[PDB]
A paper describes a structure:
To understand the structural basis of TtgR-ligand interactions, we solved high-resolution crystal structures of quadruple mutant (resveratrol-bound and apo) and wild-type TtgR (resveratrol-bound) at a resolution of 1.9 Å or better. In wild-type TtgR, the four mutated positions (C137, I141, M167, and F168) are located approximately in the center of the binding pocket and make nonspecific van der Waals interactions with resveratrol. Other neighboring residues N110, D172 and H114 make specific hydrogen bonds that stabilize resveratrol in the vertical orientation. Although both naringenin and resveratrol bind in the vertical orientation, only N110 is able to make a hydrogen bond with both naringenin and resveratrol. The ability of wild-type TtgR to bind multiple ligands likely arises from the nonspecific interactions made by the nonpolar amino acids in the binding pocket. The DNA-binding domains of the resveratrol-bound quadruple mutant and the resveratrol-bound wild type are extremely similar with an all-atom RMSD of 1.0 Å. The four mutations do not substantially change the volume of the pocket (215Å3 in wild type compared to 234 Å3 in the quadruple mutant) or the surface area of the pocket (184 Å in wild type compared to 186 Å in the quadruple mutant). The structural basis of ligand specificity relies on the I141W substitution to create a steric barrier to prevent binding in the vertical orientation, which is observed in wild-type TtgR for multiple ligands.
We chose TtgR, a ligand-inducible aTF belonging to the diverse TetR-like protein family, as a target for computational engineering of ligand specificity. TtgR is a 1-component transcriptional system and represents the simplest molecular mechanism for converting biophysical interaction between inducer and protein into a complex biological response like transcription. When induced, ligand-binding allosterically lowers affinity for DNA, thereby allowing transcription. TtgR is a compact, dimeric, all-helical transcription factor with a large cavity between five angled helices forming the ligand-binding pocket.
Author numbering:
A (entry chain B): 3 to 210
B (entry chain A): 5 to 210
The structure:
Amino acid sequence: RRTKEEAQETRAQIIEAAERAFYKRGVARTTLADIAELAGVTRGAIYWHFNNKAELVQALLDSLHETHDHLARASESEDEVDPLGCMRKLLLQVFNELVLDARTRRINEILHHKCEFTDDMCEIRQQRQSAVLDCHKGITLALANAVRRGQLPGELDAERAAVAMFAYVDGLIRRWLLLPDSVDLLGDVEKWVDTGLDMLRLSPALRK
Amino acid sequence: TKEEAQETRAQIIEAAERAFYKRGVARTTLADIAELAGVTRGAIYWHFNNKAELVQALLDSLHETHDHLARASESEDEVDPLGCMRKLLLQVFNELVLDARTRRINEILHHKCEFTDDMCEIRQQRQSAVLDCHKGITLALANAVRRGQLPGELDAERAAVAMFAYVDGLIRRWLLLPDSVDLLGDVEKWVDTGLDMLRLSPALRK
Ligand SMILES: Oc1ccc(/C=C/c2cc(O)cc(O)c2)cc1
Ligand SMILES: Oc1ccc(/C=C/c2cc(O)cc(O)c2)cc1
Ligand SMILES: [Mg+2]
Ligand SMILES: [Mg+2]
């Protein structure tokens, strides 16, 4: 109809086909030409939207923020009266979306288990570094806010606590992707979130 | 001869580490590895049925250093099982940071090895290996519980999952962003942060 609307539809068809192809065959051996054929678009069209497969990987990775942005910004705001509470809701939502949404599950499985870091495509590792560094910044801000509001210990090492928490969450996600039946991540989602928050609130090793 | 076969196998393993680390698992073939190792006339296929088996050899190689401390933590006659586990985890992080071989293998497993349907054995062998680690961790913690070193109502299974998640995530964080974690200089605090989760979180109780 209109150029932009047609372009948005094409882009979304490609991204969806990229998910399916990376998920079955992996990033290393999938080409844009392969994804174009699975999306039912021309090679000219796919290369118009994405210059290389690293950009297509980044589009998938960037798409994981959208759902959580509301709660993340709230937990990071200094004006929030209950920053720790926003973090808990954020973490529940992170796990809930991972188990229930096929798309989110698929993308995380791509990023964890179907995407390699090779100097052949150095930007895949550089983008991952940027993404994690950025999430670390946000976590540190929300923990520092929680400390200032009396919700976490006064001498918490916010930086180290932020690493601890991300490690725990990232490991649990990867474990659930590898062995879903090993973890009732949905039925016990509150215990899994609270286990991680307990570490930050109670461990003396995380204090200055 | 035994010696020359064992030496050829080792040369292949070290070559596989170099090739996988540079180009990744997905696109590296056994023939490429043999070319890098300088092994000829089909030698690699006598030592490894396929590429998955060679990946499993690298992962299996990580257990050797820690087997003593791991088995001790699992022994029902061990009087200090949690101390053996703390010694274990300190060694895991020290080796990661100090040993080029261990770091490089972990970077391969975490960041340079796809799981594909074409080669389903990689994912299945990783499942079995994590399940075996989890079985051992659970026995260590149950031992620690039995010996009054962790809370009597600890859910040993969920605790074992939590400890593994934290450790696995921290390694992977250190591999991606080394300068964000003083893993060696602060090793004791990183190990105790995780142990504190098990010792202290009410959410891991039954
Ligand atoms: O405070 C926190 C807020 C968010 C998170 C999310 C971590 C995460 C790690 C992954 O490997 C995949 C993913 O989709 C998310 C962790 C801590
Ligand atoms: O109690 C525990 C004993 C051992 C471990 C090992 C974890 C681990 C995770 C990795 O991704 C790589 C690795 O080389 C080791 C975790 C907990
Ligand atoms: Mg989302
Ligand atoms: Mg070793």
